């Protein structure tokens, strides 16, 4: 005959943002040098 009223509640939760990324690239530039440290005719005496 005794009806008791009760109130229930569950705990809340917490989320968080995040990200993923594959490997990254970057540019590059090269110029080949053309040095010619060469004389005309060295008179050798080997």
């Amino acid at each position: 005959i005794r009806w008791e009223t009760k109130s229930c509640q569950t705990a809340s939760i917490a989320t968080a943002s995040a990200s993923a990324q594959a490997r990254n690239h970057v540019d590059a530039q090269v110029q080949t040098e053309a040095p010619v440290p060469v004389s005309v005719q060295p008179p050798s005496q080997y």
Binding site: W3, E4, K6, S7, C8, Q9, T10, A11, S12, I13
Partner: protein, 86 residues
């Protein structure tokens, strides 16, 4: 699925049965509708009707229960409300 009882108006024997019954339901069934159904049916059989069971991760309720037939507890992160009314 560790059990922690938060509030009860229930005999110790029924409290233990609630935890063990809900634990079995949670091991066997993945979906709350089925977990709740398992738990409710076992109580109607053993402790007579009319039992009600709510199982979930996020809810509030306001209900009326019969004295000495109320328990609210967690299994891990899942809350189970088990009581008689009607």
């Amino acid at each position: 699925r560790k059990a922690v009882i938060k509030n009860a108006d229930m005999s110790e024997e029924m409290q233990q049965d609630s935890v063990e019954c809900a634990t079995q339901a949670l091991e066997k069934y993945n979906i709350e509708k089925d977990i709740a159904a398992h738990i409710k049916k076992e109580f109607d059989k053993k402790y007579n009707p009319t039992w009600h069971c709510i199982v979930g991760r996020n809810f509030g309720s306001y209900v009326t229960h019969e004295t000495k037939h109320f328990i609210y507890f967690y299994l891990g992160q899942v809350a189970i409300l088990l009581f008689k009314s009607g």
